[PDB]
Amino acid sequence: GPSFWLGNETLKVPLALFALNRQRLCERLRKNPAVQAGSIVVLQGGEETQRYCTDTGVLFRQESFFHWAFGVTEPGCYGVIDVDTGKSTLFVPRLPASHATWMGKIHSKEHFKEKYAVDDVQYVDEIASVLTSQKPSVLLTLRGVNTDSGSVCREASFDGISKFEVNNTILHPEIVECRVFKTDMELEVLRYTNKISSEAHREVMKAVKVGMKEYELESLFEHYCYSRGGMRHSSYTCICGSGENSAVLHYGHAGAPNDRTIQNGDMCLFDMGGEYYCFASDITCSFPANGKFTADQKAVYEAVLRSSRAVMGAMKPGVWWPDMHRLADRIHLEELAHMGILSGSVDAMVQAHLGAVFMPHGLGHFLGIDVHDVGGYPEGVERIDEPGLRSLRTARHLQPGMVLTVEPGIYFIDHLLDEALADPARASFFNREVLQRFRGFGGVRIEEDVVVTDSGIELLTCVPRTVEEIEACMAGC
Amino acid sequence: GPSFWLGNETLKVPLALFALNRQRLCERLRKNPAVQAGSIVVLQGGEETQRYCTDTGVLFRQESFFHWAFGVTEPGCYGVIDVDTGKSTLFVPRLPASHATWMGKIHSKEHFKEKYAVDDVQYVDEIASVLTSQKPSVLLTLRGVNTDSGSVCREASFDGISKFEVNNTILHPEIVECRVFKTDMELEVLRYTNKISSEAHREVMKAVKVGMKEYELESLFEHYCYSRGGMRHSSYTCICGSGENSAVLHYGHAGAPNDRTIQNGDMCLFDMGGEYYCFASDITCSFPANGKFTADQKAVYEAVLRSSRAVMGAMKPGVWWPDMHRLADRIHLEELAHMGILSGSVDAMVQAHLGAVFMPHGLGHFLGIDVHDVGGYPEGVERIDEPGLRSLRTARHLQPGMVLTVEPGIYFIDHLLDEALADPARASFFNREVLQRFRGFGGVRIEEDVVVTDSGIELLTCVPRTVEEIEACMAGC
Ligand SMILES: O=P([O-])([O-])O
Ligand SMILES: O=P([O-])([O-])O
Ligand SMILES: O=P([O-])([O-])O
Ligand SMILES: [Mn+2]
Ligand SMILES: [Mn+2]
Ligand SMILES: [Mn+2]
Ligand SMILES: [Mn+2]
């Protein structure tokens, strides 16, 4: 059996992985009472892209659904799967012999059959003819709404498609459910992205110096992942927040691109995750820039370590994800009170929604081929209309084989804080004189990637977490 | 006067650079008799994009024309220039006061006026009424054909733009012609991009070892450029061909993603250039993987070194660029004859277009904000319909201020070789028994970036070039 491999110490991923996904999608559609006999799944791969109107090629990364079904790295492909038999056909672009002048050897269709271990390979321009000869009942295409972006997924289309019966509602929720439940072969890849990203995080912690620019660490992190782990891409733009910037969720975008000089006294919050063969990792480490936690940083950090461990210790099949988020809120509030920042009844603090002031984002989300993976809110799973909870990327109950991030945080965000101090239903909880000490603290977030097993979780991530472990990693070790 | 800067040893670029561009564009438009008084240039900035239908951010890189004119790093902006007066107005998006949580500091309009040194800043939702009160005769927008991609530039559009008179033919030829001639400020940025990429090429040469994967060198090059040079993007996808892949012109892309193991005996061809503040560099180095040229490798290498130095020596205002391409072709053929690969009259070889068998691409191209920069083929300049020369990205005569790549090379491409050996008008020049030993040699390209001065050229790139220099570099002398 063939495998994708970037050599050295990188992971061998069997193409069988994708055969299993195809097989699981078919099994799921045969069980579907409204999937007609003789149906055929028709997916379209992503295409080569350029910067606006220039000839500057953009690096091609495969469309995620298409990758999940076939594992194909080349642009311009299509893929069909006969539902009743499970037979797979890949369609590759016809490159004219003259292209060998600027390409290498132009690969034969047979080269692609053995590469991807699919049942047949044909040219893209013969798609209409090839599907005609199969006399299918219906073409199942991919159309639906991603619940993190709001975008509608592009449906496959080819010249001549109008002569076929096309159903575009059935496939989306089904191919999404398959993706939510990771196979053992998929887990092996997620273990590997986490291992490599964990090593990269360790290296950053070793190298950080007061005086460096944040992007120096971004650069180091991507160099390790690529050179040591074959990860050409990151799963998302690196967030390298130091000082006040640790309080900016999604910092490091074009408008704030990791350009701050790290200073003595700053907390660093680093959320960086490499991507191997279109599989994600998503890992955040928080640590003092100088290698020594102050009392205040120890206190806030250990509050987050506490919610992290309490959530992970409680996760198991049947657990409603929003319950864990509320747990994290409660623990934050408890500890924020133990440290003297808040006073009064934790119950009262909860009933007021104070938790959302300190952790305005969701506790965690599905992870897979996308960092924010599909299937958090299928039909019938409602968004909870409350501050904090409304940002959860899923409201599902945990089941074995799900892959989630566990990412609690405590931040000191000036405009959430000024709001609470202006709301008489929230103001009384604050001790202004101690709060003043934490203005500009930034934030801590501790983000693990876990798998939901039959009875608990498997922790994918391996970074130092306790105060002791972190101060030791930063000093060598 | 304010400047773009990324700290450390990174280059300070004065925002005055872009004011000069706006000034120069206006002066050229004023001379154009089709341009009506009261005309306003309206450019639209690039927007934030995501991976297909997911919420995975793609790192924002500004549209080229817009950057040339304003140097704005933020997504979602417009920018207008009053032709008669030269006053610039930047339009920035109105971000709801309520998501400082996720963005950070919502910057006021004065911040941006200060930041970019424009005459005025307003919100984007106000663009129709801001323009309406200026009572323009005509809006000049940007539409044209890029002569490398064949793509049509996206013309600026906003809500209520159909109430204006809009012209979309005048601007493109004029803004392109300004981009062709680099100001002293632009040149300073280009010296820097070349300095940094040259330093990185030197590091890639000291680091190359047999048994490494090509992408390890790509990763290091990029890491030097980012951590050491502030270059978050490269100018194009790194080409790291070794062995037979050094003969593959479009190498490095998704379908051949630098995944070959560097072998003893291989030639390497590394084409890589970092990008700083959307300014490009374009450098190719060629060298033996093991750090030592064989006789065959030296002969071919010194053939390309010869034509590189000949072309650079010849360049001056007034020189027709296709004559330089021809001069490279003649030098290659001379050397390939001295080597025994060819026999007979070099004049006859030239008449038969045999040079394009060994160098199928153009000698070089304008370089600027884009690596294949705009303006090689404006009205009245035609593509020469002959092998090799048809691939030239410009057929213009050289003038002070133009920046070009000089990138001759020799490759052994089976498709081209086989075609030529079947043609009795070309076959006779080959010594097949000598040609044999060079099959699967790969190729060598030597690529320098230069500026045309009043009297000749200025060389920007600073890498090892002679056989002695390269071997001494690789041995870690
Ligand atoms: O970014 P995130 O990971 O979702 O928090
Ligand atoms: O799982 P669920 O919760 O039923 O969605
Ligand atoms: O890529 P290139 O440099 O244009 O050849
Ligand atoms: Mn994260
Ligand atoms: Mn996450
Ligand atoms: Mn190049
Ligand atoms: Mn070039």
- The amino acid that residue B342 corresponds to is L
Instruction: Give which of B287, B242, B285, B286 is closest to B262, Cα–Cα.
Output: B242
- The amino acid that residue B110 corresponds to is E
Question: What radius of gyration do chain B's Cα atoms show?
Answer: 24
Interface test with B, best of A13, A54, A216 (most B CBs within 10 A): A54
Q: How far is CA B414 from CA A107, B75, B288, B299, B340, in A?
A: 15, 46, 21, 20, 18
- Give residues whose Cβ lies within 5 Å of ion ligand 5: A 282, 405, 407
Counting atoms of ligand 1 from 1, which one is nearest the CA of A405?
3
Question: Quick check: B363 and B325 in contact, CB under 8 A?
Answer: yes
| A372 annotated among ligand-binding-site residues | yes
Beta strand B166-167 with B139-140: parallel, antiparallel or unpaired? Answer: parallel
Same domain, A175 and A226: no
Distance of alpha carbon B343 from alpha carbon B333, whole angstroms: 10
DSSP annotation of B162? G
Cross-strand bridge partners of residue A409: A445
| CATH number for the domain that contains residue B421 | 3.90.230.10
Tokens matching residue B27:
């002066």
Same domain, A154 and A233: no
Q: How far is CA B444 from CA B36, B246, B469, in A?
A: 52, 7, 16
Question: Quick check: A329 and A345 in contact, CB under 8 A?
Answer: no
- The amino acid that residue A190 corresponds to is L
Instruction: Give which of B271, B193, B250, B208 is closest to B470, Cα–Cα.
Output: B208
- Indicate the SS3 state at residue A266: coil
Same domain, B149 and B252: no
Distance of alpha carbon A169 from alpha carbon B236, whole angstroms: 39
List the domain range (segments joined by +) for residue B410: 181-477
Question: Quick check: B221 and B237 in contact, CB under 8 A?
Answer: no
Tokens matching residue B317:
């205002």
Same domain, A188 and A172: no
Q: Point out the domain boundary residue: A180, A206, A228.
A: A180
Report phi then psi at B234, rounded to 5.
-90, 165
| CATH number for the domain that contains residue B58 | 3.40.350.10
Ligand 1 binding pocket (C-beta < 6 A) is: A 271, 282, 361, 365, 407
Report phi then psi at B180, rounded to 5.
-60, -35
Ligand 2 binding pocket (C-beta < 6 A) is: A 381, 396-397
Beta strand A78-82 with A40-44: parallel, antiparallel or unpaired? Answer: antiparallel
Question: Quick check: B248 and B210 in contact, CB under 8 A?
Answer: no
DSSP annotation of A101? G
Question: Quick check: B472 and B464 in contact, CB under 8 A?
Answer: yes
Same domain, B170 and B215: no
Contact: B213, A100; criterion CB under 8 Å: no
Distance of alpha carbon A129 from alpha carbon A121, whole angstroms: 14
Contact: B52, A215; criterion CB under 8 Å: no
Distance of alpha carbon B27 from alpha carbon A184, whole angstroms: 66
Q: Point out the domain boundary residue: A147, A165, A180.
A: A180
Distance of alpha carbon B53 from alpha carbon A41, whole angstroms: 19
Instruction: Give which of A304, A287, A289 is closest to A468, Cα–Cα.
Output: A287
Q: Shortest Cα distance from B366 to chain A (angstroms)?
A: 13
How many C-beta neighbours within 10 Å does residue A169 have? Answer: 11
Contact: A255, B51; criterion CB under 8 Å: no
Torsion sign, CA atoms B331, B337, B341, B345? positive
Q: Select from B55, B74, B104 the Cβ nearest to the Cβ of A254.
A: B74
Cα(A393) to centroid(ligand 4), Å:
13
Instruction: Give which of B346, B402, B352, B347 is closest to B374, Cα–Cα.
Output: B402
Cross-strand bridge partners of residue B90: B79, B121
Question: Quick check: B474 and B293 in contact, CB under 8 A?
Answer: no
Beta strand A139-140 with A166-167: parallel, antiparallel or unpaired? Answer: parallel
Question: Quick check: B7 and A213 in contact, CB under 8 A?
Answer: yes
Interface test with B, best of A55, A176, A217 (most B CBs within 10 A): A55
Same domain, A246 and A133: no
State how many domains chain B has: 2
Same domain, A221 and A111: no
Counting atoms of ligand 3 from 1, which one is nearest the CA of B236?
1
Distance of alpha carbon A176 from alpha carbon A65, whole angstroms: 9
Q: Name residue, tokens 């803004």.
A: B175
How many C-beta neighbours within 10 Å does residue B301 have? Answer: 22
Distance of alpha carbon B130 from alpha carbon B430, whole angstroms: 69
Question: Quick check: B371 and B197 in contact, CB under 8 A?
Answer: no
Sheet strand arrangement including B403-406 = B403-406, B448-452, B457-459
Q: How many distinct helices (H) and strands (E) make up chain B?
A: 15, 18
Q: How far is CA B395 from CA A340, B322, B377, B455, in A?
A: 74, 6, 7, 20
Output the DSSP codes for B76-139. Answer: T-EEEEETTT--EEEEE----GGGHHHH-S---HHHHHHHHT-SEEEEGGGHHHHHHTT--S-E
Cα(B92) to centroid(ligand 3), Å:
35
Same domain, A79 and A107: yes
Output the DSSP codes for B143-159. Answer: --B-TTT-PBPPPP--T
Tokens matching residue B254:
């998704």
Q: How far is CA A188 from CA A3, A12, A226, B86, B397, in A?
A: 13, 10, 19, 60, 59
Q: Name residue, tokens 């086989």.
A: B418
Question: Which residues 6+ apart lie within 8 Å of B349 measured at CB?
Answer: B333, B337, B342, B355, B429
Same domain, B269 and B416: yes
Same domain, A191 and A175: no
Same domain, B379 and B396: yes
Q: Point out the domain boundary residue: B147, B162, B180.
A: B180
Same domain, A212 and A353: yes
Distance of alpha carbon B245 from alpha carbon B412, whole angstroms: 11
